[PDB]
């Protein structure tokens, strides 16, 4: 089934709900991985690699290092897969 913004956001958050270092009750679509969820940049590398696995494509280093909340990930996936609704 073709990707939608709703499906992208649901799957991004699903991946994060399986990352065991995140407190489930602080996770929101605008939770900053560092300032809000208490993660570090080693965790962030792993999280973006998990997004690559979920959506089936690689994210260049320069792009991956900028994605620090779920909404930024959603926006990026939607862009790179050309999803508009």
């Amino acid at each position: 089934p073709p990707l939608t913004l709703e499906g992208i956001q649901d799957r991004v958050l699903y991946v994060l709900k399986l990352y065991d270092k995140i407190d489930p009750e602080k996770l929101s679509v605008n939770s900053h991985f560092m300032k809000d969820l208490g993660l570090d940049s080693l965790d962030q590398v792993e999280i973006i690699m998990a997004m690559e696995d979920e959506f089936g494509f690689e994210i260049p280093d320069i792009d991956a290092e900028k994605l620090m909340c779920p909404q930024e990930i959603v926006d990026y996936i939607a862009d790179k897969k050309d999803v508009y609704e």
Partner: protein, 74 residues
């Protein structure tokens, strides 16, 4: 520097995924994660360079092991 450490961290985890056996993928990933994290709060700059050089070297070790595994494959 921070950027160099994180680039090597990602590169090593990427190579780890290329092992064919599940157990050895998980072994490599666990070793990489523990090795980088257990040095997170090192401050001595020369000690940092030493650890960076180890990562550079072990990235080579990982790549050679991946290649040899491909040769023993079916």
């Amino acid at each position: 520097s921070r950027a160099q450490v994180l680039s090597l961290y990602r590169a090593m985890l990427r190579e780890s995924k290329r092992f064919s056996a599940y157990n050895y993928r998980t072994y490599a990933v666990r070793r990489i994660r523990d090795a980088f994290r257990e040095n997170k709060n090192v401050k001595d700059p020369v000690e940092i360079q030493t650890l960076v050089n180890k990562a550079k070297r072990d990235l080579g070790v990982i790549r050679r092991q991946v290649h040899i595994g491909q040769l023993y494959s079916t």
